[PDB]
C-alpha cells in the first residue's frame, strides 16, 4: 500500500489496542513521524507499538488501501462486538488541517465513505480525529501560552482584557505551522486530542444534502451563510469529547462550500469577487503617492505581499490583466486601471494579451476617486486573514456597479450592463426633491413599481438591439455587392469573438459547402470579413435559411443574431445566496446601503474636525507664547512637560487627531483627550515663522466654517447628505464622459 | 495553415513586391493588424496589400507551414535570378521581441535555419528583420521623444548632458510593450525600421558552432563573456541598413546562452546564483526594520515586487523554502532564514515541506549580519533592470562561502562542503602577522605550494570519511542482532534521501530475494531501517557480494557507500566560465577580492564622517545662539535663509550627509558642500533641550576619536584593514557557533 507504515501490534492479539492516523498529505506524515518517535522523551506518550501512519492524498485507491490495512467488509454490518472485534485496528483517527480544504472537505468526505457504507461504525465510535490549538497567546515573561480550540473562544477571552500590548497571537490554520517545541508540546497530550464523532440523529439527510448532489435542499440551505457554534455547544464538546457529524457538517463543510461561491459569484454591492477586490483594495494602495507605472508582476506582487492573496499568481496576473482591458465588447466597461502597453483585442476574446513582463499599469485615479470615495473606506466592515486587516466586506460604490458592466461565469450568472444615461435619471429622481418625479420614493421602493426605464447598454455597438417581448436580441451588420457575390460582415452582434466566429463557421458542414474561402482583414476595434463563395450561390441560401421574422434569410446563414438573457445570481453581505429576478430590486437593495454610510461620514468627520481645530487653536496659542516661555532653557522632556501644564496647555495624542484611521467615534471621544505634550514639542522651527502662523490662522477659520456646514447638512431633508450625493453623481459622470473621450487613457 | 493571413497580391505579377512578417507569438500579430489596417492615416505605409502575417509560436510544423506559403523547395538552391523569381513572398521579415527569448533564440534559429538549406537567400537579401526602438526619452513639453536603438547609444548620450531630471525614460525589452500611439509612430516610418541580414564571411562556422551542439569550440567560446557593439560597427549598421550574422550571433545569441548558464551555475565569490540573490538582498531589506515572521507567499510577493523577479512564483517560492531547511544532509548548511513551521525532513529530500501559505519566515539577522555586512553593500557593482536598481552583481562575504556549504546541479556543477575549522585556519594564516605560518603569503599563493589542510565537512554525519588515493568516500553503519537474524540500518551515507534508498533496495530483484520485508521507524533526524530478511541468509549474501578492500560484505549488499566526486564549475564576475580543480584556488582566486573592500570601505566612510562632524559643530553652534537670534521674528524662509547666511553658517544638503547611499567619494567632495539651510531650519524643538545638546556633544567627541583611529587604520601592515577583518572573522565564528548549539533556531 502506498504510504503506509504499519503498528509493530496490528493484527496480533492486541490489535484493538491499535489505532490508525490517516493524514491528509505529505508534511502531516513527518509531523506524525516527528511525534510518533519521541521515545525517552515520553515514556507513555503514543510511538510505533500501538500506532500506524497511512495518507489520504489523491481524494478510489487510496480508499481501497484503507480498506485493505484495516480489514473492512463490503458485505458485514459491524452491528456486533465480534464482528467488529477482528478489525485490525481499533479506531481510525484523521490528521487533518483545520482549514477549510482539510475539515471541510477531505473530513467530510471521509464521514460520507464510512456513513453511506459502514453506518454502525460511526455509532459505536470507531471514526475520530484529533483536534489541534488553532490560536495560541504568548506574553512576554511567561512560556505557556493560552491554547484556544476555536475562534469564538479568543474572542470571549479577549473582550474581559484591557491592555492587549504586550500579548503576541499566533494562528494555526494548518498542521505545517506548529514549531518544533509546539508539536513536543502536543504530543505529550495527545489523549486529550482525539475526539469521537457520534452518529447524531439529524445527520442522515444532512449527509444526503451535501455530499448527494445539486437540488433543491441544498440549494435552499446554502441561501443563509454560516452560523457559528456558541458557548454551550462548545463547552459540551469539551466536556465528553465527543462531536456530532451535525455540527461538523453544519459548520466545517458549509463554510468550504461557501468558500467556493464566493469565488465565483459577486456580492450584489459593487460587483466584484473576493479576489477582485484584493485587487482593487491593493491598488488603491501603491499608486496613492506617485501614480506610476508598475509592471504587472511587480503589483501582482505587492497585492499578494499587502492584501493576502494567496492563489498562486496566474490567476492574480489574469485578474490584473483583465482590470485594465478596455476593447470593444469586453467585461469591465469602466476599468479600474489604464493599460499602458498592449493588454489584448476583441478578435480573440481578450486572451491574446502580452506577457506580463513587459505590460505596465496605473490606476484611474480620477474615476476611481470619485466612485469609491476615500472617505468612506474607513467605515466600511473588513476582513481579517489571521488577525490582519486585508479588504473590505463590501465596498459602497456611489453607482450601482453590479448592473452597470458586463459579466458572466462558464453556478449560473451572466449580467448584461445597463444604460447609463437611465440608471442616472432613476438614482437623481430618488434623491432631488425638486426633481418632478420624486415620487418614486415610495411608489417604486415600498414595493416594487416602474417610473423610469431602463434598457440595455449600447455603447461601443454598431448592431442593433431589438426587443420580443420578453427578450433582447443583439443583431449584427453586413453588405453585399452581387457584381462578384461577396458579403462582408461589418459588426459581428455583441460579446462574440471574431476567431470564434470564425471557426464556428468553419466547423459547421452543412453552409461550408455554399462558401469558397473566408478570411478577415478586420483591425483591433472593427469588424471587415470577406466571405469567398461559389457561383450560383445567391439564391439558394435564400430558399434553404428561411426569411423568419426575427432572423432573415442571410443572418441566420451566417449566425448573426444572439440572446440576451441574464442569470442573476449574487452574494448576501453577511453571507449566502440571493436570486434576483429583475435588474431594478438590485439597486433598490442597493440604495438603503448608500445613505447609510452618508450619514456615518458626516458623523465621524463632525467629530474629528472639533478636536482638530482644538488642537491648533493651542498650537498657534505656544506659537506666539514661545519667544518668551524659551523652553531651551529647561533640562528635559518631562520637565518642559511639567512646565508647559503649569501654562494650561492641554495633553492630546497627536497620531489619532491628525489621523483617526479606523477608531470610532466612541473610541474618538474616549481616549483621544488625554495624552502628552509632542504636538507642541515636535515641531519644526518653520512653524515659528510668521508665513506659516498666517496659513494656519486661515486654516483654523476654514475649519470653523466648515463645522457650521456639517451641522447644517446634518438635519436635511430627505435625510442627511442629500446635498453630498449629488454632486458625487456629478463628478463620478465627468469622469466617466472625460474617459470615453480619451479611450480611458485619461490626458 | 494555422495563423497565416495571406496578402491579396501574394503569387501574381507583383508577387515580388510582397513581404510575409513571421511575428513571434500572438500578442505580436494583434500588434502588425494594429498596424497594418491604419488605412486614411497611412496614405504610404504598409497594409494587407502587399504583407501577410504568419506565427512562429512552438519552436516541425509552423516551419512546414513557412514552407507551404512561400512555396520553398527543399531541392532548389536559388542562385540564378529566375529560381527564386517564382516564390510567393518577396522576403521574409522577422517582428520578433527585442529580449534574450526574441532575439536570442527565435531569431537565430530562424538564421540557421535559411542557412542550413538554402544558404544563397540569406546572401541575396531574402532574410531580413524589423528593428524597433529599445530605449526612448521623454521630456516635458515637446511631444518628440529620442529614439534610441541600442542601450550604447543612450549611454554615450547620457554622458554629454548635465540635467537629468526633467527627463522620464522609457525602456522597451518586448514587443507588446508599445502604447497605441506609439505603434501609430512606428508604422509610418514602416521603411527605417527593416534591415537585411548579410551572410559574413565567418558566419559560417559560427552557426555550427552554436547550433550545432555541445563540443569544445562552443565550451571555449563560451569563456569570455559578452563583448557589445562599438560605435563604429553601430553607425555602419545604421547607415546601410544591413546587419551581419555574425554580429547578431556574437552579441545576441551569445547574450542567451550565457543566460541560460547563470541561472544554473553559481559565481564564485558568494556561491549563489541570481535568484538567490535576488531573494538574498530582497530578505535583507524587508527584515531590516522590524524581524517579525512573514508567511513565505507574503514574501514571495515582495521578492518579486522590490527585485525585479520575474520567472513566476513557483521557483521563487521553491528557493525561499530551501532557502530555510535545516536537517541534516541539506543544501544549505547556514542558512539565511529561520524556518517557523515545518519545511522537510531528510527521508524524502527536503520535498516534503509544507504549503507556503501556512509557513513563516524570518532572517538570520546575527549570522547574515556578521556574513554580509551592511556597509560593504553600497560599495559592490549592482545590476540594472529597465534602468531601476536591483541588486548586486556579485556579494562579497567575509569567508568564503562557495566552499562551505553543499550544491549540486541535476553544466555538470557539484560541490561537497568543506571543514569549517581548516578554513579559518588559513585565512587568518593569510591576514594575521604574528601567526607563525604567515609565509602562506607568498609560498602558497604566488608560487601554488600547499601548506594547510583542507578536508571534507563532516558534521551532522555519524558515518566514516575514508580516502583511497585520490577521492574520498562516504561510508554508513549498521548493527546486526544475528539471534532473529534482522540488520538494522543506523545512518545512512551523506546526502542519500531515505525513500530513495528504500527504493533503490525495492528495484533491485537481485537482492530482494535475499530479504522479506522492509520498514523503517526512523525519527525526524536519525535513521532506524529494520530489514527483515529470510531464513538461511545471513551466510550466503557474504558469499556472493565479496569483500572489497573498500568495500565490505554487507556494505555492497545494502549500498552503504557513497562517492564523493566534485565538479567545479563557476561564473566570472564579469562573465564567462571557470573550470577550476582544486578547492584551494577558488579561496586563492577570492582573497583578492577582498582586502580592496576592505580599503574602499575606510575610505569612504572616512570622508563621510569629516562631513558629518562639520554639519554637528555648525548645529551645536546655532542651538547655543538660538536664544539670540530669534529667528521667529522674522517673515519667510528664504529670508531667514539670508539672515543664517548672514552670521556665518555653511549651506550644506541634509539629505546627502546623513544617508550618503551609492555616491562615490568624488560625488561626496563636489556637491555635498554647496546647498541650503534646512539641517537648522528643520529641527525637532526637542533639540533644543540641554540633555539632547549634551549627547550631541559627545556624539561629536566619539566622532572625532573614530577619525584618528579610521586615519590610523588606512596606514597598517600587510594592508589597509587587517585589523577590522580578525574581528569579522571572530564575530562570524561566534554567530555560526551561536547558530550550531541552537539547531539554527537563535533564541
Known sequence: ????????????????????????????????????????????????????????????????????????????????????????????????????????????????????????????????????????????????????????????????????????????????????????????????????????????????????????????????????????????????????????????????????????????????????????????????????????????????????????????????????????????????????????????????????????????????????????????????????????????????????EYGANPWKYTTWARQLEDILALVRAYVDKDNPKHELLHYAIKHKITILPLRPSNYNFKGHLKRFGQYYYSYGTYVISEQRNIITITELPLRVPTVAYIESIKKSSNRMTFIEEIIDYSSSETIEILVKLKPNSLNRIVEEFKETEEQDSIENFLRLRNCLHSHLNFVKPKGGIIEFNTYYEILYAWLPYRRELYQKRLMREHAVLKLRIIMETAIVRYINESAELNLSHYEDEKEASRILSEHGFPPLNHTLIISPEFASIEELNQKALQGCYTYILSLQARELLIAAKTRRVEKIKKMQARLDKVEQLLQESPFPGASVWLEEIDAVEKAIIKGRNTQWKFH
Open 1 to 404: 500500500v502506498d504510504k503506509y507504515t504499519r503498528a509493530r501490534n496490528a493484527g496480533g492479539k492486541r490489535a484493538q489496542d491499535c489505532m490508525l492516523l490517516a493524514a491528509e498529505g505529505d508534511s502531516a506524515l513527518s509531523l506524525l513521524r516527528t511525534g510518533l518517535t519521541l521515545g525517552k522523551s515520553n515514556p507513555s506518550g503514543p510511538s510505533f507499538d500501538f500506532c500506524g501512519m497511512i495518507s489520504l492524498g489523491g481524494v478510489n485507491k487510496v480508499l481501497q488501501g484503507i480498506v485493505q490495512v484495516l480489514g473492512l467488509d463490503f458485505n458485514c454490518h459491524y452491528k456486533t462486538q465480534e464482528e467488529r472485534a477482528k478489525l485490525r485496528y481499533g479506531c481510525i483517527v484523521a490528521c487533518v488541517d483545520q482549514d477549510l480544504d482539510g475539515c471541510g472537505k477531505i473530513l467530510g468526505l471521509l464521514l460520507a465513505y464510512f456513513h453511506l457504507f459502514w453506518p454502525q461504525l460511526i455509532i459505536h465510535g470507531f471514526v475520530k480525529r484529533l483536534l489541534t490549538p488553532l490560536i495560541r497567546v504568548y506574553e512576554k515573561g511567561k512560556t505557556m501560552p493560552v491554547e484556544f480550540y476555536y475562534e469564538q473562544e479568543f474572542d470571549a477571552w479577549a473582550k474581559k482584557q484591557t491592555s492587549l500590548a504586550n500579548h503576541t497571537v499566533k494562528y494555526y490554520k494548518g498542521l505545517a505551522a506548529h514549531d518544533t517545541h509546539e508539536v513536543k508540546s502536543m504530543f505529550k497530550h495527545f489523549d486529550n486530542m482525539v475526539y469521537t464523532f457520534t452518529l447524531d440523529d439529524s445527520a442522515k439527510e444532512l449527509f444526503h444534502i451535501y455530499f448527494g448532489g445539486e437540488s433543491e435542499l441544498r440549494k435552499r440551505e446554502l441561501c443563509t451563510g454560516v452560523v457559528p457554534l456558541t458557548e454551550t455547544q462548545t463547552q459540551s464538546i469539551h466536556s465528553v469529547r465527543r462531536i456530532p457529524c451535525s455540527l461538523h457538517l453544519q459548520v466545517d463543510t458549509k463554510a468550504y462550500k461557501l468558500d467556493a461561491i464566493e469565488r465565483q459569484i459577486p456580492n450584489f454591492l459593487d460587483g466584484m469577487t473576493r479576489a477582485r477586490r484584493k485587487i482593487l483594495a491593493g491598488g488603491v494602495k501603491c499608486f496613492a503617492s506617485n501614480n506610476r507605472e508598475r509592471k504587472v508582476f511587480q503589483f501582482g506582487g505587492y497585492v499578494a505581499d499587502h492584501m493576502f492573496y494567496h492563489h498562486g499568481d496566474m490567476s492574480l496576473n489574469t485578474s490584473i490583466i483583465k482590470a485594465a482591458q478596455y476593447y470593444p465588447g469586453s467585461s469591465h466597461l469602466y476599468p479600474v486601471f489604464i493599460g499602458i502597453g498592449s493588454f489584448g483585442s476583441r478578435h480573440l476574446g481578450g486572451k491574446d494579451a502580452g506577457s506580463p513582463r513587459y505590460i505596465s499599469v496605473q490606476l484611474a485615479s480620477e474615476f476611481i476617486k470619485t466612485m469609491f470615495p476615500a472617505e468612506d473606506s474607513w467605515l466600511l466592515p473588513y476582513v481579517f486573514e489571521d488577525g490582519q486587516r486585508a479588504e473590505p466586506e463590501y465596498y459602497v460604490p456611489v453607482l450601482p456597479l453590479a448592473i452597470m
